[model samples]
Target: GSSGSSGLTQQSIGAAGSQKEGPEGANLFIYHLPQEFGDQDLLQMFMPFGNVVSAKVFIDKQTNLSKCFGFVSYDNPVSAQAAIQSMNGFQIGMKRLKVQLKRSKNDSKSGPSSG
Candidate 1:
């Protein structure tokens, strides 16, 4: 049931460069993750920033392996902000992450079109 970060598809260069609304008190959309990354990796990675609500990594259903992406939700908006500010563009091993607020109409009545 836990798909992990691999469920999150990588963005095109153009998509990654676009300015997003940024992080808030919400789940994170993490991109460009390394194959070795996992839920615990996110927990360890973001916990220093602040209190984490939850951490999850999308895995391949068939292979049950890392998908190189995941989500980390913070209890405080400031923590989320701090995480993005300090962690964005930061390299983990060889993977540079694009971390941001995971936006959806469920959170906002109308915002990004959930693909």
Candidate 2:
């Protein structure tokens, strides 16, 4: 969920320049994503929504298969917002990909904070 000029592992995107992960961890969109999809397809699916800042498909580092999850970063909040309304619960192929706006948080189970 960490992204920046340095990627999730704080790595590089080579000469293409780095696309940072959203500050609030905007990858939250995957929660609504239907469990089965591939990287290229996901990109094609999410990119039209914006100038696509960055996109990532999480694999089981060990197995190398998609964890059926990923993160997509948009250049501006507006794109993310448009994506949320347009794509949430969008059925693609045999699956429906979920979408969400991520937020920074501590485990709420500990009890609500003094907002």
Candidate 3:
């Protein structure tokens, strides 16, 4: 007598959600920029941290000149935070750089502070 034989096998692999994408970007406010500083200068300064999406030196609409302040945008928040850590309080000639996260229009609408 021959006995009927049957075999079945099943396997499953666990998957993880490790392919998450980063945010669009983070903007940084730069202050105490030298009068001679330009857009390229701003880009160069922050490029070491990470991908610099864009850099701009604020210009006077009437005078069409540097306003001694500007903004830098990085492709990720990590880069922006790195820039703030390394560049904040950095000195150029006599003035120290004041780097901070740029605030959005919505953030500006806050209650008045007593001073």
Candidate 4:
């Protein structure tokens, strides 16, 4: 005759969709990307750095060809700096990766011309 043993089964309830609560991350402007590269390729390349929020490769709508440049976003600024340190000037065949912080829309060179 075995008595009923109370087995405390603890169920870990994980909160869903509540992890993304913070300011936006840093954006990297990458240039000299390979012509064959796509959005997925860019994502995969920078995935190891950190939580990649987005990866986009510019494509010429008219020609449907790569623009040899792209953008990568990380959930943290540290990750962006890390990626730039490791990937900047990284050579691929005849091209070298140019990684830098993406500038804001108002960061253009249209300065006040007082001539």
**Which candidate comes out best when scored by lDDT?**
4
lDDT of 3 by residue, 1-115 (tens): 2213223121111111111223444778889888767777777677667765567787776876777798877668988898899999999988898998886544355587774
In the range 26-106, model 4's lDDT, one tens digit per residue, is: 778899988878777777677667666667788888887888998876768898899999899999878789998886554
What lDDT tens digits, residue by residue, belong to model 2 across residues 1-115?
3236432323222212233576553443565343445555556667656556566666566766667666677657877788888888777656676778865565647466785
TM-score of 4: 0.69
**What TM-score do all the candidates reach, one by one?**
0.66, 0.61, 0.68, 0.69
Query: Model 4 — which ten-residue stretch has the worst lDDT?
Result: 8-17
Screening candidate 3 with a backbone cut-off below 3 angstroms (N, C-alpha, C), the clashing residue pairs are none
Off by over 4 Å in 2: 1-19, 23-28, 32-36, 106-115
lDDT of 2 at 52: 61
Clash counts for all predictions: 8, 7, 0, 0
In terms of TM-score, the best-performing candidate is 4
lDDT of 1 by residue, 26-108 (tens): 55778788776666666666766765666777668798777877777665688788888877898877668888877667543
State the weakest 10-residue window (summed lDDT) of model 1. 9-18
The per-residue C-alpha lDDT of model 1 at residue 49 equals 72
